[PDB]
Amino acid sequence: SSSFDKGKYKKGDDASYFEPTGPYLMVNVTGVDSKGNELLSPHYVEFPIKPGTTLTKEKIEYYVEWALDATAYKEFRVVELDPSAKIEVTYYDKNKKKEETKSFPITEKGFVVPDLSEHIKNPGFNLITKVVIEKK
């Protein structure tokens, strides 16, 4: 209908925390009414990371839209999408760097997905955008 048909599945690979396990790239939305009354929870679609895609507003806007549409796409139209989209990459190296939810926003024509520094195995790139959904 609108709010998925998997529900926080992330393909099976639920690498929450506990040591450097393995990376992921989790593509959904914080789909709210307008303010923050969550119609649908994210974390149902997830792809294994392959750096190359242009990590910018252009390919964040429609990218998350295609992910949720590849689950529902029945009652979904969108009033508006927020320009200040965000990526909450969380890197769980319990050795040196440690859990840091780096909630960087976005730029129009910034940059491609960068390399994972040195002191980390498992970045948790959370491609999650707050949007104002129209449920048709």
Which DSSP string corresponds to 38-73? EEE-S-S--B---TTS--STHHHHHHHHHHHHTT--
- Residue 23, helix vs strand vs coil: coil
Instruction: For the chain, list the domains and their CATH numbers.
Output: 1-136 (3.10.20.130)
Q: Is 127 within 8 Å of 25 (Cβ atoms)?
A: yes
Round to the nearest angstrom and report the end-to-end CA distance of the chain: 10
> How far are the Cα atoms of 4, 32, 50, 52 from residue 69, in angstroms, in the given order?
9, 16, 21, 23
> Can you name the residues that pair with 102 across neighbouring β-strands?
89
Q: Provide the experimental method for this PDB entry.
A: NMR
